[PDB]
């Protein structure tokens, strides 16, 4: 029933004022972040020297305590400054600058949403962040800067009080999501538009947030394929823009009338970095 142009006109007519966004690894592959599950990149080769039975073991606690070096190889690669936000991130930044963003929920741990200038209060880094770390033994918290030197020197960071391994506050499988994730209880009932960008929706409880908006709220998916509860429980006002994520974003930006403003923003922000 609804088209991408229909959704754009809802925004242009100010019929939608409170957009909630969900994003995943697909929005950051254009920045050059190798989606490590695939054997192409050089980060993959740095992990192939290790004990890794499969890619997701890098985010599992039993493997981590057996051998933390693969995870900290990834941590070293995602160090701030190695990668920059791309057009999809700045589309979300411009969405915030134009007063439309209720909240951005992200599964990514590359920190690029904050780098693009989205304020922390508008962001829920649902699978954690490298901005802080916790001793796995004594539970002391540390700023992420405190483990930087070790990580960049390929040393596993240890606690200065108890010598336990100090683990960045990335959410591993089996761990609770951060306290800010609780904002979903009020954000999703309050949204009048849901945007889902670049995620396969294969991890819970993040994926089921798609079902938490009201029945009248359009759900616009910009993604390679139809995934998650949007495939198994489709609703009448769902819109699927299937294809390259950046091309779907570029199409929406043009329909909204934002193209020149978005390019000006990207030019100035990339130069600041």
């Amino acid at each position: 029933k609804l088209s991408l142009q229909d959704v754009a006109e809802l925004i242009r007519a100010r019929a939608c004022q409170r957009v909630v966004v969900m994003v995943g690894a697909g929005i950051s592959t254009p920045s050059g972040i190798p989606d490590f599950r695939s054997p192409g990149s050089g980060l993959y080769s740095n992990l192939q020297q290790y004990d890794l039975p499969y890619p997701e073991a890098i985010f599992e606690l039993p493997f981590f305590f057996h051998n933390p070096k693969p995870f900290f190889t990834l941590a070293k690669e995602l160090y701030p400054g190695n990668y920059k936000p791309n057009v999809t991130h700045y589309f979300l930044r411009l969405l915030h600058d134009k007063g439309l963003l209720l909240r951005l929920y992200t599964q990514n741990i590359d920190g690029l949403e904050r780098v693009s200038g989205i304020p922390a209060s508008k962001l829920v880094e649902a699978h954690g962040t490298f901005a802080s770390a916790t001793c796995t033994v004594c539970q002391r918290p540390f700023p992420g800067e405190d483990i930087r030197a070790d990580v960049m020197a390929d040393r596993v960071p240890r606690c200065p009080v108890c010598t336990g391994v100090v683990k960045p506050d990335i959410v591993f499988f089996g761990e609770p999501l951060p306290q800010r994730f609780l904002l979903h209880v009020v954000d999703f009932p309050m949204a009048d538009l849901l945007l889902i960008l670049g995620t396969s929706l294969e991890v819970e409880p993040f994926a089921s947030l798609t079902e938490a908006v009201r029945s009248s709220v359009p759900r616009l998916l910009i993604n390679r394929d139809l995934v998650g509860p949007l495939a198994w429980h489709p609703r009448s006002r769902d819109v699927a823009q299937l294809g390259d994520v950046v091309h779907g974003v570029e199409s929406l930006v043009e329909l909204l009338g934002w193209t020149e403003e978005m390019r000006d923003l990207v030019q100035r922000e990339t130069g600041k970095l």
Binding site: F173, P176, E202, E204
Partner: peptide
Amino acid sequence: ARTKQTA
């Protein structure tokens, strides 16, 4: 789910 889990 209340913890991060594969769907």
